[PDB]
Ligand SMILES: Cc1cc2nc3c(=O)[nH]c(=O)nc-3n(C[C@H](O)[C@H](O)[C@H](O)COP(=O)(O)OP(=O)(O)OC[C@H]3O[C@@H](n4cnc5c(N)ncnc54)[C@H](O)[C@@H]3O)c2cc1C
Ligand SMILES: Cc1cc2nc3c(=O)[nH]c(=O)nc-3n(C[C@H](O)[C@H](O)[C@H](O)COP(=O)(O)OP(=O)(O)OC[C@H]3O[C@@H](n4cnc5c(N)ncnc54)[C@H](O)[C@@H]3O)c2cc1C
């Protein structure tokens with residue numbers, strides 16, 4: 146069995162890369178550990194940068210998004226009994242962000258790949274990578290008992306934080322940068338109209354709260370929660386009461402509550418690995434880096450890694466410029482670090498940290514007051530929020 | 540012995556306030572623990588905001604400053620083998636800062652006060668404050684053995700961090716916010732031409748370094764140093780070798796060195812007290828708050844506290860509006876916290892901290908890269924550096 150580019154993982158990174166590649170004539174096979182239904186069960190992201198919206202268009206998978214996605218020109222930050230709106234469009238020079246669930250984006254890509262007839266092997270068990278530094282690397286996996294081999298020219302590791310690809314690089318070739326936060330986010334998806342037409346990030350003494358949405362009749366809410374929490378300890382009613390306690394009274398008053406469709410706790414973490422490649426293996430997305438959700442950069446950084454890898458692969462196959470692939474890590478890391486910095490800043494100013502001295506609390510509050518009250522401060526938030534520009538390459 | 544406003548401390552705060560008050564017809568007496576020469580021996584500040592320059596003009600003590608002070612339109616930040624210039628004038632909408640030593644400002648004020656014949660009692664020993672909540676507070680002190688009493692309407696505590704005024708307020712009425720940094724600055728004053736026409740703040744792996752100046756033939760340099768250091772362990776030659784090691788090669792190459800005129804170590808600290816007054820006692824300057832030197836806000840915040848106190852006192856005496864004095868703390872604290880936030884940020888991005896993990900070092904470096912590479916980022920530094928506007932009152 147042979148292909149040009151083997152892709153490990155059928156989450157958004159792998160699917161987007163596979164779609165872009167197929168449309169350009171570069172054959173690729175995707176190997177996924179889980180089933181289509183399992184992948185489709187993950188809620189995750191809701192906010193997309195303009196760059197990701199354009200990439201979906203280029204992959205030709207934007208029909209439903211153009212119809213159903215909601216374009217947001219602003220976002221609100223509530224703290225110390227006040228709500229401040231950041232006009233993203235005005236402050237960033239016209240850019241906006243789009244709210245369209247990750248589940249939906251993934252569904253669109255999966256349907257698109259099926260229709261084109263490209264290869265996808267679900268339940269590909271025990272994937273192993275071989276001869277990464279050779280001129281002919283290969284992947285082995287098991288499908289219903291028998292171990293099969295897939296030969297390829299390159300391998301794109303799009304297998305997330307727990308994937309096999311990053312584990313396949315000699316640990317000594319990698320530099321790991323990581324920070325673990327002492328809290329997680331308890332998220333709740335409900336078939337109820339959102340409390341606002343724009344997102345509301347709230348810094349409240351009891352902890353962080355976020356009011357988001359999926360459509361005009363579907364909402365997604367989050368509350369900061371200690372790591373010791375178990376989801377079974379949080380009934381829907383406990384969640385609504387807690388969420389209400391963290392929001393401005395005028396917002397809590399018109400909040401329409403309802404039974405949860407999904408409820409889960411996600412731990413917050415920052416993680417970056419340098420470099421993002423090894424021989425003929427290139428890491429993309431969560432496989433190479435994790436950002437806390439606060440800045441809504443995770444799926445968006447995955448999109449930029451993919452945009453970059455795809456364009457370099459194109460140069461390699463169409464133009465015989467295989468040497469440009471060595472620049473992959475350098476190009477992606479510039480964007481990754483600025484997004485990590487922004488996600489880290491958002492996290493530190495919106496959440497309540499354990500054992501914080503009086504000085505730090507006051508500085509936290511002053512950061513908000515300064516950045517939300519200065520035209521220059523607002524612009525730094527806005528340009529980072531809508532997403533910094535992708536680098537062009539070469 | 541009686542006056543209208545008793546002022547404790549003859550450093551810049553006390554002198555500036557006393558001068559402004561005298562010029563407006565409000566009698567005031569200054570009590571200073573040390574001698575004129577001792578006060579004049581402190582080097583300290585070199586950078587003044589436009590607001591402080593205007594206050595000196597209003598006090599009528601700007602002749603020498605207008606002649607000798609250097610107006611700077613920019614400043615440089617060196618990090619990771621690169622120097623980036625921040626055009627303060629362009630980015631802040633036309634404001635600049637002035638380099639004129641604190642020693643000189645103090646000398647100008649002292650000469651001005653002597654010529655006007657206002658009262659100043661040096662070597663005023665064992666100053667004690669009494670009946671702060673009464674309608675008639677008073678100050679007692681000792682002059683060559685005998686204990687004298689000074690009656691007044693109000694008392695301005697301009698006695699610095701170790702003064703008696705803050706200690707005279709019942710500790711329970713005060714909220715203290717403080718942060719101690721694990722390093723200090725070793726400063727060296729030399730009669731040598733500065734290495735640059737603008738200041739250079741340098742983040743180097745060995746620690747922070749700063750190239751400043753006093754005039755075209757006098758320089759002031761600083762290097763970050765551990766708290767365990769003793770000045771006697773730092774010969775002039777050791778200092779020059781260390782400074783050179785922390786600067787970009789092209790800057791170190793044209794550095795003119797020479798014997799030190801003054802050498803000292805200043806510990807870095809952030810300190811704020813709320814409120815800044817008690818009864819008829821009002822704290823101003825270092826008596827109420829300390830900021831690390833990195834942002835050059837100390838003397839400048841003292842100027843804004845003084846500007847505010849003076850204007851409120853004027854309203855009180857000239858217009859019988861004594862009730863406006865209750866707003867002193869609220870007005871000053873707004874500016875103090877934003878300046879504390881800026882000084883804290885500058886300190887965290889330019890210095891090397893003990894036991895820093897890989898993630899934090901990378902974030903530190905990325906903060907610099909982002910703020911120095913974005914038009915919006917540059918503007919946040921510039922507007923804070925030149926100094927945020929003074930509030931108008933009422
Ligand atoms: C609460 C939450 C909110 C978020 N909100 C946002 C937001 O609004 N905006 C945004 O930009 N980002 C957000 N993110 C981040 C975003 O969801 C992730 O960055 C994104 O899922 C990355 O996609 P990926 O394809 O790299 O990895 P994944 O989605 O993790 O997919 C990886 C795939 O590889 C498969 N796989 C794993 N191991 C193997 C193996 N050994 N062999 C074969 N296949 C394997 C997995 O099964 C999975 O299907 C959020 C994340 C969370 C948890
Ligand atoms: C290394 C260094 C660099 C700095 N660089 C800058 C810079 O470039 N720009 C800037 O804005 N700031 C800078 N600062 C800060 C600035 O020097 C201080 O904020 C400033 O001195 C505050 O003035 P002040 O009058 O409040 O207090 P002080 O200058 O401390 O004067 C207080 C006076 O009160 C007297 N006194 C004390 N106790 C008593 C008592 N019990 N009775 C009577 N009198 C008493 C003292 O003797 C002293 O004369 C720097 C500080 C340092 C140390």
Ligand SMILES: Nc1ccc(C(=O)O)cc1
Nearest residue numbers: 189190191357438439441
């Ligand atoms: N920053 C975030 C904003 C929104 C969401 C979400 O809608 O799921 C998640 C993170």
Ligand SMILES: Nc1ccc(C(=O)O)cc1
Nearest residue numbers: 583584585751832833835
């Ligand atoms: N930030 C600072 C800049 C300059 C000086 C100084 O010249 O003494 C001190 C601090």
